């Protein structure tokens, strides 16, 4: 009775009111590209990678934030949508550093992969790039902030999940920088999760630095024993050696987080 | 449960082909030991034939039995026609393999495997 009918590329789907355009696409197995959106954080709407055409509407909408209206037809593969994705990816990569060989995110990078699937195959950026100084936030999270794409996921996670309001943005415009402003360490029992949610290699694990590449790791699904919560984990190994520990999603236990001791 | 047969329509029909194969293998061992100049006795060769047949005694699907006979006849053809060499015949006997530990304590001492 409550449900309303919307269409994803002509395919009817029934959704509760308040469902976003992006969520309506999930229902038919279509994953809209995203950077700033994380389903466990508050909606931001700033990366613009999720722009999608609504049939008969002249303006693309941010699928992650726009509530779907009755009778809307979401064109997830139209020319307008594809050009919107190409344009955004082009801006994201304009100042991004040519770091993939030396960057630990390489091989499991959402920027790399969505560039491969939704971006152009070349550059027309002829200028010099931005370079940003690095911030020390403790012995666990290395920062290479020239890689940061300003998605604000780390800021929202810290404020909402960790309950620590130490991360923010300073400056304005192209010089907007994520950090603590002052010299401050982000030491929280949940701090290491910002490594996972950072879509790029801007935030990386210090202990893990340089030791492995994602494709070569074997994944063993296991359980944490550092406490009695029973957090579900993945143990990455290579050639018989434990390389790192990652969260494994379990809605009823740890969701997709783990503590710094577990990590 | 209605399937296409291979050769036999039931276990009694299949068990006939097993017996015919066993006789063929039984009578071939003496010539095999001579032709390949094997150092095993004829009794060892037949004891090996019987052992190979006995590990499949629990099969009750006629189609599986048919394939085992089909494969057993290919193995016999390879032997009678000397397509096999001496190494291939003696591979049944695992002469260079040291005896693996079977009881729990022995397995525990040497490694982690069950």
């Amino acid at each position: 009775s409550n449900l309303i009918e919307v269409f994803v590329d002509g395919q009817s789907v029934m959704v509760e009111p308040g469902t976003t355009v992006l969520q309506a696409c999930e229902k038919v197995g279509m994953q809209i590209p995203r950077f700033c959106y994380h389903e466990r954080l508050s909606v931001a709407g700033n990366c613009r990678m999720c722009l999608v055409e609504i049939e008969k509407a002249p303006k693309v909408v941010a699928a992650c934030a726009m509530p779907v209206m009755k009778g809307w037809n979401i064109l997830t593969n139209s020319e307008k949508t594809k050009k919107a994705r190409e344009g955004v990816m082009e801006f994201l990569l304009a100042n991004h550093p040519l770091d993939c060989p030396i960057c630990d995110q390489g091989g499991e990078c959402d920027l790399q992969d969505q560039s491969m699937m939704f971006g152009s195959d070349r550059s027309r950026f002829l200028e010099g790039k931005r370079a940003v100084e690095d911030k020390n936030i403790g012995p666990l999270v290395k920062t290479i902030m020239t890689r940061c794409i300003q998605c604000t996921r780390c800021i929202r996670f810290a404020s909402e999940i960790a309950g620590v309001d130490d991360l923010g943005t300073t400056g304005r415009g192209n010089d907007m920088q994520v950090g603590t402003y002052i010299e401050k360490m982000f030491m929280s029992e949940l701090s290491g999760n910002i490594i996972d949610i950072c879509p790029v290699g801007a935030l990386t694990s210090k202990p893990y630095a340089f030791t492995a590449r994602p494709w070569e790791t074997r994944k063993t699904e296991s359980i944490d024993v550092m406490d009695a919560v029973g957090s579900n984990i993945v143990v990455s190994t290579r050639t018989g050696e434990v390389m790192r520990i990652l969260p494994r999603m379990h809605e009823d236990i740890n969701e997709e987080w783990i503590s710094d001791k577990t990590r | 449960t209605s399937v296409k047969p291979i050769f036999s329509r039931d276990m009694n029909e299949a068990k006939r082909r097993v017996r015919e194969l066993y006789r063929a293998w039984y009578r071939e061992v003496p010539n095999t030991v001579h032709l390949f100049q094997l150092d095993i006795s004829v009794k060892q060769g037949r004891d090996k034939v019987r052992e190979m047949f006995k590990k499949n005694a629990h099969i009750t699907d006629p189609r599986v039995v048919d394939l085992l006979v089909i494969k057993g006849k290919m193995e016999l053809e390879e032997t009678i026609k000397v397509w096999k060499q001496r190494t291939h015949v003696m591979r049944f006997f695992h002469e260079t393999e040291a005896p693996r530990p079977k009881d729990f304590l022995s397995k525990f001492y040497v490694g982690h495997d069950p």
């Binding site: 040519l98 070349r122 550059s123 950026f125 590449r213 | -």
Partner: protein, 379 residues
Amino acid sequence: NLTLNFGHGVLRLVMELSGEMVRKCDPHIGLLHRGTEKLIEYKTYLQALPYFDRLDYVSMMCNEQAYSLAVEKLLNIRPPPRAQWIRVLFGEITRLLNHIMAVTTHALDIGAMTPFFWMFEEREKMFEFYERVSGARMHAAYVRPGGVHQDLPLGLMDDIYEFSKNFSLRIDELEEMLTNNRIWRNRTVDIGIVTAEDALNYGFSGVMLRGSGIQWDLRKTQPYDVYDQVEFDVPIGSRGDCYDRYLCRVEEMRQSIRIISQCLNKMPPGEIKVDDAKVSPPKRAEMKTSMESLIHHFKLYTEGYQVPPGATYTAIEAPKGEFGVYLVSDGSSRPYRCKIKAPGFAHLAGLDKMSKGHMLADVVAIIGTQDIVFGEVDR
């Protein structure tokens, strides 16, 4: 009936003889089976390419071309015109390489050892063309889905012209030794006769078909790359025997020089791999300056390009006959299944049929007329 257990690679022949006559030929192969098809399933599409050099390892770049065409077909992309001309140019150089090996080792096996030496000095010069474009004399890994790896170095086309200018005289010297030699004709004329209808039903291809009068050549009937833009004649036999098939191969070498000449004259300018960096890696200078180019380089050399799901049978006129692949994509960057159709596989399966009513020494001539390399037979 005496049984002989033994009588390119290594082959085990089990023969039944009634005096001088062969009553049964049972080739036992697999002595060079290396599970290539299974290995390819653990490789990206690029990582699998060098396996094709090592099949018919006399016709390396033609095997590469067949695989590249198959992948290009599933990718739904098109290699650029200059790449197509290079591929035809080196396809025909490769045919010369193969036919020299086929004809002179066929001659060497039945006692005529000297043309092998004269023509292998010509092979040595074509190995230099391989090495100059690719850095390897044999397993070039040069032809790839999307085009070729590198453009020709300056000065190569001039040296190919110099080689081609003189080659037909070298064929003439080979023909003076064999074509009219009564001993050579005694060993090949009316040997291994195969009828047009039998050849088709036994799955023969290439010269094994045309020697028997069948007018079939994939370069003419189902052309690929720029073969529709070059002129040449398909040699056709009349008696379906070893001697006619020898004549077809010799004449095919002459037509290869004819094609090579047109390729040199018609070579166009431009890029040599598809201008699509989601398939073909960017130029090194771009990879070192542009963010998109570096990402695409990183991904093409680690994950590789994803191929849309589907299956294709793609075939070419290789020097030994129809060479094809049945390539199945599951949508990922690794092939799900790659069946390699080798022309020599069906030809060797027909050895027993072809050798009926012949003598032992003729079995050597028949295996030679079939042009058998066990890299592609066993895979």
